[PDB]
Design a binder for this molecule. Structure first.
Ligand SMILES: Nc1c2c(nc3ccccc13)CCCC2
Length: 288
């Protein structure tokens, strides 16, 4: 069993199938529309330049949406948005998106090709420490080695009335169950790392930071995962298991318990003849 994250090709295909059969993206859309406003309501107060640091170039369309809400609250104010992404493929895509978008004259972009870690290391070399008004980490901690250290660092980069926003899958979610129980039995990679909003609050508690957590429901239609032979079904399987060609490369003893175990409540809910996997999300905001 080889980690799915080691086959850039498969991954994407799957990831893509994941978005196509989930309310993930719309879920964040709702957060940004009905909650974000009041959250970032004062990060611009008294500043003639609003700085926004985004760690991860995977949700370009979401980043842009954040800008939309920040511009609305602070008309005229120029915005400096830096992006810290390791994947050239991503940055590349991001950029394309920028060029095709309007109402971004009062925004300055700057992409840095590296990891949160590398970025962080560098900064320390600099003598001066630079602050920020808004930091955010959408679905990417999974790929961070030192969470506690990472959290504390960027918190210190927050300026006055600044805020840091983090998104991960919720403790009360299918993923949680899927990992607490089966994890050990899946390919242990050094790149990925199973983490839930739960692991998060404990770390933040022990760190002593003041945060606020919000959960919203999101689903993943895994119906094609019971139709033996279905191509689509196969990809999805690859995703949950974060493994390559899961079926044809895993112990049926296991693939047997899952097939059963997934169609159960604590993992999924049965709807319009559909089997919906609990993809609930958590949004954490941290004060400076
Ligand atoms: N829903 C997601 C999960 C992971 N990464 C993701 C990356 C961005 C979009 C959603 C994601 C890793 C493990 C589990 C779930």
């Amino acid at each position: 069993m080889r980690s799915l994250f080691s086959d850039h090709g498969k991954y994407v295909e799957s990831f893509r199938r994941f978005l196509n059969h989930s309310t993930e993206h719309q879920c964040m859309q709702e957060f940004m529309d009905k909650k974000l406003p009041g959250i970032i309501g004062r990060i611009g107060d008294t500043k003639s330049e609003i700085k926004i640091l985004s760690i991860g170039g995977g949700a370009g369309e979401i980043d842009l949406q954040i800008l939309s809400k920040v511009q609305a609250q602070y008309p005229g104010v120029c915005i400096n948005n830096e992006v810290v992404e390791p994947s050239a493929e991503q940055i590349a895509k991001y950029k394309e998106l920028v060029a095709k978008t309007s109402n971004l004259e009062n925004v300055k972009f700057a992409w840095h090709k590296e990891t949160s870690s590398e970025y962080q290391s560098r900064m320390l070399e600099k003598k001066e420490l630079q602050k920020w008004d808004f930091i955010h980490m959408i679905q990417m901690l999974y790929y961070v080695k030192d969470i506690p250290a990472t959290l504390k660092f960027f918190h210190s980069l927050l300026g006055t009335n600044a805020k840091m926003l983090i998104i991960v899958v919720s403790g009360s979610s299918g993923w949680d169950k899927l990992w607490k129980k089966y994890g050990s039995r899946f390919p242990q990679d050094d790149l990925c790392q199973y983490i839930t909003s739960d692991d998060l609050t404990q770390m933040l508690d022990n760190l002593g930071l003041k945060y606020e957590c919000y959960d919203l429901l999101s689903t993943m239609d895994i119906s094609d995962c019971f139709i033996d032979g279905n191509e689509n079904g196969d990809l999805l399987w690859d995703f949950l298991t974060e493994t390559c060609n899961f079926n044809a490369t895993a112990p049926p003893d296991l693939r047997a318990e899952l097939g059963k175990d997934l169609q159960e409540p604590e993992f999924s809910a049965k709807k319009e003849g559909k089997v919906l996997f609990n993809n609930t999300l958590s949004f954490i905001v941290i004060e400076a």
